[PDB]
From a paper:
Unlike canonical cytokines and chemokines, a trimeric MIF molecule has three tautomerase active sites at the trimer interfaces 23. Although the enzymatic activity is vestigial, there is accumulating evidence that the active site is important for receptor binding 24, 25.
To structurally verify the proposal for the inhibition of p110γ and p101 expression, we co‐crystallized 1, 2 and 12 with MIF. Because of this higher occupancy of the active site, 12 may stabilize better the conformation of the active site than 1 and 2, resulting in no disruption of MIF interactions with its receptor. The phenol ring of Tyr36 was moved from the original position (magenta) as shown in 1‐bound structure to a slightly open position (green) in 2‐bound structure, and to the fully open position (light pink) in 12‐bound structure. Apo‐MIF and MIF:12 complexes exhibit B‐factors under 5 Å2 for L2 loop, indicating low flexibility and possibly stable interactions with receptors. MIF:12 shows high B‐factors only for L1 and this also suggests that L1 may not be critical for receptor binding. Thus, it is likely that 12 disrupts L1 interaction with either CXCR2 or CXCR4 and is also responsible for the partial inhibition of p110γ expression. In contrast, 12 did not significantly inhibit neutrophil recruitment.
Author numbering:
A (entry chain A), B (entry chain B), C (entry chain C): 2 to 115
């Protein structure tokens, strides 16, 4: 797994430690090893949510398995929680798209996972 | 629904009001309430279309339903007409990837939509 | 096709010619006409792979067909090799997500391809 957050929150409001905290929490939540987790934060974006430019986020979580109805609900709680606490973004201004990737459709180290 | 555009056009060519205009036009086109529509514009990108770096765009529209053959063609006409009129990007240098998201694979407000 | 690379490598490390080379090499690999191929490179990103901020990349390749077990392995070797050679990113710090798009879900030139 890989997690991307795009946000209008400015770069200086992103705590040092944030990427490393995302990595560790995602390891716990997904059961995958932290050494294979990727995280990407994109601040200072030009975006609106409901026509307003108060803090908001558009995110994604890609995983080879560990995606489904109950799991995505816990991920959303965890992730919205982190975004609320660390970036001061309200949970109702965050979308997270979940993608269950086939191992054949993930490239890594000159090959794929299948 | 959420709409993202990445483009090589500079930020200063993005008119003021463009995010509001996208929000209102997508609200009408999708039928979804405006307060839930998210829009994201990413100018000044390093990109090329057909090997040429004249103005271009790579876009996404995600929605829980309201995605399909005829509807997608209609969204493309709407959206390419906005990009052409507002950012001066020729419609034949724009791609829009459409994603019909399962409600269970969209996180929002600490949970999902299923 | 369309290929997007996101990376923490700095902008000044992306060689002139890189987008053309990607274009040409993707034409060769996918067999599609160069004029349809879109490429997009986003340097200087805040990102981590395995908790480390050594050079890394998160990529996508979208195509209408020409995605599959063996083809994806071949694309990963090609694109990781370019990333290693031109941006100095180790292949084991690159993820590439592959998307086989339905023609109906690709907008272009006021319409879609289905």
């Amino acid at each position: 797994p890989m997690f991307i957050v795009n946000t209008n929150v400015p770069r200086a409001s992103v705590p040092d430690g944030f990427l490393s905290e995302l990595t560790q929490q995602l390891a716990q939540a997904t059961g995958k090893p932290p050494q294979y987790i990727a995280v990407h934060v994109v601040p200072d974006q030009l975006m609106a949510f409901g026509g307003s430019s108060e803090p908001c986020a558009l995110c994604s979580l890609h995983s080879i398995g560990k995606i489904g109805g109950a799991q995505n609900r816990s991920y959303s709680k965890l992730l919205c929680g982190l975004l609320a606490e660390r970036l001061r973004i309200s949970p109702d201004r965050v979308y997270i798209n979940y993608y269950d990737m086939n191992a054949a459709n993930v490239g890594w180290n000159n090959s794929t996972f299948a």
